Amino acid sequence: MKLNISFPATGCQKLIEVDDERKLRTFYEKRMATEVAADALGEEWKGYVV
């Protein structure tokens, strides 16, 4: 699983590679265009909404 992440207001991107089953647990059984806060994603994220 790779994540392709984008900051619109800044106008930037990064390709992150995530292998953790939990981090993806938060994303499974999800439809497109839904908002999930990225928490399990890492320590830094926290209040980040994706």
Binding site: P8, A9, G11
Partner: protein, 62 residues
């Protein structure tokens, strides 16, 4: 047991510096007040009117 709620999400246009004018110039011209702009407009308008009647005299000269 069911979901009756339909979420309404909002769209926001942020600001970015456009290449050749940094966010300081965009905001410098944006936040410029009505006195400043009205002065600039009427001054450029009168400069243009003078150049134009000068070129009307330069039409009738030739």
């Amino acid at each position: 047991x069911x979901x009756x709620x339909x979420x309404x999400x909002x769209x926001x246009x942020x600001q970015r510096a456009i290449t050749g004018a940094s966010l300081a110039d965009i905001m410098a011209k944006r936040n410029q007040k009505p006195e400043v702009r009205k002065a600039q407009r009427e001054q450029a308008i009168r400069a243009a009117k003078e150049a134009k009647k000068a070129k009307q005299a330069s039409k009738k000269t030739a």
